[PDB]
Design an enzyme around this catalytic site. Structure first.
Site, mmCIF file in Angstrom:
data_model
loop_
_atom_site.group_PDB
_atom_site.id
_atom_site.type_symbol
_atom_site.label_atom_id
_atom_site.label_comp_id
_atom_site.label_asym_id
_atom_site.label_seq_id
_atom_site.Cartn_x
_atom_site.Cartn_y
_atom_site.Cartn_z
ATOM 1 N N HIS A 11 -7.599 5.535 5.963
ATOM 2 C CA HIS A 11 -6.323 4.881 5.654
ATOM 3 C C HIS A 11 -5.138 5.190 6.575
ATOM 4 C CE1 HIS A 11 -5.316 8.649 3.476
ATOM 5 N NE2 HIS A 11 -4.061 8.267 3.630
HETATM 6 C C1 LIG Z 1 4.541 6.629 5.409
HETATM 7 C C2 LIG Z 1 3.871 7.303 4.249
HETATM 8 O O1 LIG Z 1 4.535 7.847 3.362
HETATM 9 N N1 LIG Z 1 2.427 7.278 4.222
HETATM 10 C C3 LIG Z 1 1.644 7.915 3.132
HETATM 11 C C4 LIG Z 1 1.140 6.864 2.192
HETATM 12 O O2 LIG Z 1 0.404 5.937 2.907
HETATM 13 P P1 LIG Z 1 0.136 4.483 2.360
HETATM 14 O O3 LIG Z 1 -0.806 3.819 3.310
HETATM 15 O O4 LIG Z 1 -0.251 4.483 0.906
HETATM 16 O O5 LIG Z 1 1.576 3.830 2.574
HETATM 17 P P2 LIG Z 1 2.429 2.935 1.616
HETATM 18 O O6 LIG Z 1 2.985 3.708 0.465
HETATM 19 O O7 LIG Z 1 3.500 2.324 2.467
HETATM 20 O O8 LIG Z 1 1.526 1.801 1.061
HETATM 21 C C5 LIG Z 1 0.824 0.958 1.939
HETATM 22 C C6 LIG Z 1 0.205 -0.238 1.310
HETATM 23 O O9 LIG Z 1 -0.812 0.177 0.418
HETATM 24 C C7 LIG Z 1 -0.750 -0.697 -0.711
HETATM 25 N N2 LIG Z 1 -0.545 0.071 -1.962
HETATM 26 C C8 LIG Z 1 0.075 1.272 -1.867
HETATM 27 C C9 LIG Z 1 0.279 2.020 -3.016
HETATM 28 C C10 LIG Z 1 -0.172 1.503 -4.222
HETATM 29 O O10 LIG Z 1 0.002 2.214 -5.374
HETATM 30 N N3 LIG Z 1 -0.791 0.315 -4.250
HETATM 31 C C11 LIG Z 1 -0.969 -0.395 -3.138
HETATM 32 O O11 LIG Z 1 -1.533 -1.470 -3.209
HETATM 33 C C12 LIG Z 1 0.291 -1.704 -0.430
HETATM 34 O O12 LIG Z 1 -0.292 -2.824 0.190
HETATM 35 C C13 LIG Z 1 1.166 -1.026 0.499
HETATM 36 O O13 LIG Z 1 1.967 -1.877 1.281
HETATM 37 O O14 LIG Z 1 0.297 7.508 1.196
HETATM 38 C C14 LIG Z 1 -0.830 8.145 1.789
HETATM 39 C C15 LIG Z 1 -1.627 8.697 0.669
HETATM 40 O O15 LIG Z 1 -2.583 7.842 0.164
HETATM 41 C C16 LIG Z 1 -0.395 9.205 2.768
HETATM 42 O O16 LIG Z 1 -1.535 9.744 3.418
HETATM 43 C C17 LIG Z 1 0.552 8.650 3.744
HETATM 44 O O17 LIG Z 1 1.087 9.711 4.556
HETATM 45 O O1 LIG Z 2 -10.869 7.928 -4.291
HETATM 46 C C1 LIG Z 2 -10.175 9.100 -4.008
HETATM 47 C C2 LIG Z 2 -9.892 9.455 -2.682
HETATM 48 C C3 LIG Z 2 -9.177 10.640 -2.475
HETATM 49 N N1 LIG Z 2 -8.791 11.423 -3.524
HETATM 50 C C4 LIG Z 2 -8.008 12.634 -3.220
HETATM 51 O O2 LIG Z 2 -6.899 12.208 -2.432
HETATM 52 C C5 LIG Z 2 -6.405 13.364 -1.802
HETATM 53 C C6 LIG Z 2 -6.018 12.968 -0.418
HETATM 54 O O3 LIG Z 2 -5.095 11.906 -0.413
HETATM 55 P P1 LIG Z 2 -5.049 10.820 0.740
HETATM 56 O O4 LIG Z 2 -6.381 10.798 1.458
HETATM 57 O O5 LIG Z 2 -4.707 9.487 0.108
HETATM 58 O O6 LIG Z 2 -3.857 11.179 1.709
HETATM 59 P P2 LIG Z 2 -3.628 12.265 2.817
HETATM 60 O O7 LIG Z 2 -4.220 13.594 2.373
HETATM 61 O O8 LIG Z 2 -4.231 11.774 4.108
HETATM 62 O O9 LIG Z 2 -2.129 12.311 2.909
HETATM 63 C C7 LIG Z 2 -7.456 14.369 -1.852
HETATM 64 O O10 LIG Z 2 -7.029 15.448 -2.637
HETATM 65 C C8 LIG Z 2 -8.613 13.650 -2.403
HETATM 66 O O11 LIG Z 2 -9.494 14.443 -3.166
HETATM 67 C C9 LIG Z 2 -9.080 11.047 -4.792
HETATM 68 O O12 LIG Z 2 -8.726 11.744 -5.746
HETATM 69 N N2 LIG Z 2 -9.763 9.903 -5.013
#
Ligand SMILES: CC(=O)N[C@H]1[C@@H](OP(=O)(O)OP(=O)(O)OC[C@H]2O[C@@H](n3ccc(=O)[nH]c3=O)[C@H](O)[C@@H]2O)O[C@H](CO)[C@@H](O)[C@@H]1O
Ligand SMILES: O=c1ccn([C@@H]2O[C@H](COP(=O)(O)OP(=O)(O)O)[C@@H](O)[C@H]2O)c(=O)[nH]1
Ligand SMILES: CC(=O)N[C@H]1[C@@H](OP(=O)(O)OP(=O)(O)OC[C@H]2O[C@@H](n3ccc(=O)[nH]c3=O)[C@H](O)[C@@H]2O)O[C@H](CO)[C@@H](O)[C@@H]1O
Ligand SMILES: O=c1ccn([C@@H]2O[C@H](COP(=O)(O)OP(=O)(O)O)[C@@H](O)[C@H]2O)c(=O)[nH]1
Lengths: 362, 362
Positions: free
Chosen positions: B205
């Site tokens: 992601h």
């Molecule tokens: C810039 C920033 O803060 N990035 C964080 C964000 O990335 P993440 O990729 O989730 O960034 P966003 O919060 O901007 O969401 C991105 C896209 O994901 C979708 N969306 C997001 C959330 C949700 O509850 N439902 C949904 O559908 C939407 O299309 C949205 O536009 O969260 C990740 C955890 O998973 C983190 O690793 C990232 O560091």
């Molecule tokens: O289907 C999933 C995928 C990930 N995780 C947890 O999500 C956390 C990591 O979050 P993410 O990969 O979204 O973001 P990042 O760590 O890169 O910021 C970890 O603790 C995982 O165990 C989870 O609970 N369910």
């Protein structure tokens, strides 16, 4: 390809003017985004006029507010413009909320940020200006440092040396482009003669000094005492924040009651340069005024506990007295007898041209 | 006097859970401000439920948007809450936009910021996470570093040593508080058996991987090739950003067409820990998953050009392959034969309690 200058406030307009002068001599596609953080005519319009600057292409009309409100609106609105215009470099100057917002938007859009006046440190990282400048420096692609001290500050925070250029401070260019204009303009001379031969010039607007009633009271007490001890007239150009706070704390009427203090609304750059040049000494908490006092060889007393231009203290041009009236009294005596010779640490007044050359080559 | 935890996203909720567990054993007045950056039930609600966390006192409902829009709204709305509630410490975890916004608001309000998971560096300061973490570290009053590497990163950026505490990573606490719960829960076991004995687990992601079509295509190609060469089933938990991008770039239908790939919607922490623990190897660009793979002694292959947890590579638990399918193929061979013994660099799982003790004493 395309350069955007983002600015918001009085000191930014002045310090960006030499960069604008330099850009005008090139084929670069550039424009100004104004956040309108400052909006009062004597804080904004007058500088565009006196400095012969073009109208901003964008006015975001953000204005005043608390830090989160103001900076947040700036992130939203600056991003809308940058997504449309897609410059490949953004230029910001100094340490205001406008600077931080511009840099933060650009950094997330992967647009190179050029920070003019990079690396200054007071190490009072509780000050909003110190926060703004430190954060901006850490997301900048070009760091235009005014001195070797500033470069060393940046190196100590792990910033890569190839990003850092010691170019001097553009305020030298500005003071050097405009002092002779001011001196030879009859309207400016007429203003000066209307306002003023022996006087001290005062400005005061740091948040930590004017938002805090007992600090503000202490400084006012100090000024009243200077007047009595040294029998000196004071000319006080009063920032609108400071006017608002003085009235809030019921100190304004006491200043206006002092017949040795002449309170004036903020004036244009040409007018202010004349007031600085002719002052027996300058009392301030302004960053730019500390620099100008040094450049103009007028002794300066800084009403702060620290400064982010320590070179002015290092060369003997400036002394820090903070809140303390006894320190202020002693400093006036020292500076009244100070020979007005010292080195200028801020360069030879071609910083704007050097900055534009660096951005041109990359 | 009063502590506010500000969070927004899945990984923050998980990594703050041990701090919440520790706070519950004290007399501290604390509450949670949720920006609702994440809002989908499987990204948010499920973690509050499985981790037995209290409802946030504030939900700001910011949700998705571009960086300036999202961060700007956060500055505005977080500031409204902090002006009302006036905590004297704000706790933020990690490197999301929520973290930066919380820290920036608090810093300008002169409220101490405690940064959990401070000092991590990929040195890809073009990544939004790297920007967020660097900026946050420079306005934090307490920097809770997971390792000595992280502490040294902070020292190299000139941060004062007395602000830095090497406390381990709270993800150890979380993985250690919850793995035995997951293992002994019949519903979790039933989920696992419904989904899964030999498989690779995949998550992907990072913005730089999934927003860029040819990088995403390269990674998908790489996964298709792993499957053919090693005859291995893949379980892919697909982040909603990644699902949206895969469909945008017309790659989604190709994955679903691959009968050796099982695509699952994001699952709860207990369920995911079971998938990690039982995987023959883990393929990821997640920060937290790199740590969990290391903790669980499951070999990891990181689909990035760099990592901000280099200790996982240093101890032999992890290897970086970026975009490159040949590097991916070789890495699978190496990791398939890798003995699942290595040191755990992230501490002994009492980081949450140590953090709360430090904040209590100051
Ligand atoms: C810039 C920033 O803060 N990035 C964080 C964000 O990335 P993440 O990729 O989730 O960034 P966003 O919060 O901007 O969401 C991105 C896209 O994901 C979708 N969306 C997001 C959330 C949700 O509850 N439902 C949904 O559908 C939407 O299309 C949205 O536009 O969260 C990740 C955890 O998973 C983190 O690793 C990232 O560091
Ligand atoms: O289907 C999933 C995928 C990930 N995780 C947890 O999500 C956390 C990591 O979050 P993410 O990969 O979204 O973001 P990042 O760590 O890169 O910021 C970890 O603790 C995982 O165990 C989870 O609970 N369910
Ligand atoms: C946080 C920040 O960016 N501070 C900068 C800002 O301070 P400055 O004190 O001007 O900060 P603000 O822009 O927040 O304005 C403060 C107050 O001044 C009044 N006001 C301001 C502008 C105006 O055109 N008219 C007006 O009346 C308002 O009451 C306003 O609320 O500009 C100064 C230059 O002068 C800089 O030295 C400061 O670093
Ligand atoms: O009535 C005035 C007072 C100041 N200045 C100029 O304002 C600049 C400094 O701005 P300010 O003191 O508001 O902010 P700071 O430098 O502290 O950020 C200097 O170049 C001054 O010459 C001006 O033109 N007119």
């Amino acid at each position: 390809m395309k350069l955007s200058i983002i600015l918001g406030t009085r000191p930014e307009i002045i310090k960006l003017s030499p960069i604008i002068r330099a850009l005008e001599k090139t084929n670069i596609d550039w424009h100004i985004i104004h956040t309108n953080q400052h909006y009062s005519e004597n804080m904004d319009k007058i500088f565009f006029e006196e400095l012969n600057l073009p109208n901003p292409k964008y006015n975001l009309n953000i204005g005043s507010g608390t830090h989160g409100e103001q900076t947040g609106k700036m992130l939203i609105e600056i991003e809308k413009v940058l997504l449309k215009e897609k410059p490949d470099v953004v230029v910001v100057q100094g340490d205001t909320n406008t600077v931080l917002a511009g840099a933060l938007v650009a950094s997330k859009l992967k647009i190179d940020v050029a920070h003019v006046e990079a690396g200054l440190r007071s190490f009072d990282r509780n000050m909003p200006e110190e926060i703004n400048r430190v954060l901006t420096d850490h997301i900048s692609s070009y760091l235009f440092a005014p001195t070797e001290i500033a470069k060393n500050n940046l190196l100590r925070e792990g910033i890569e040396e190839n990003k850092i250029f010691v170019v001097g401070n553009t305020i030298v260019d500005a003071t050097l482009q405009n002092l002779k204009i001011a001196e030879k303009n009859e309207n400016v001379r007429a203003f000066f003669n209307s306002v003023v031969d022996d006087y001290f010039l005062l400005t005061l607007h740091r948040a930590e000094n004017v938002d805090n009633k007992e600090r503000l009271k202490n400084i006012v007490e100090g000024i009243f005492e200077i007047i009595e001890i040294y029998d000196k007239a004071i000319i006080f150009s009063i920032h609108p924040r400071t006017k608002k706070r003085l009235k809030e704390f019921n100190l304004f009427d006491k200043l206006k009651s002092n017949k040795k203090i002449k309170i004036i609304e903020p004036v244009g750059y040409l007018e202010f340069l004349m007031l600085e040049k002719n002052a027996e000494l300058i009392l301030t908490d302004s960053g730019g005024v500390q620099e100008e006092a040094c450049i103009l060889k007028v002794p300066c007393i800084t009403l702060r506990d620290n400064t982010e231009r320590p070179e002015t203290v290092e060369v003997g041009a400036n002394i820090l007295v903070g809140d303390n009236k006894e320190k202020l009294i002693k400093a006036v005596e020292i500076m009244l007898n100070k020979k007005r010779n010292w080195k200028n640490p801020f360069g030879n007044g071609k910083s704007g041209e050097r900055i534009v050359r660096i951005l041109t080559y990359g």
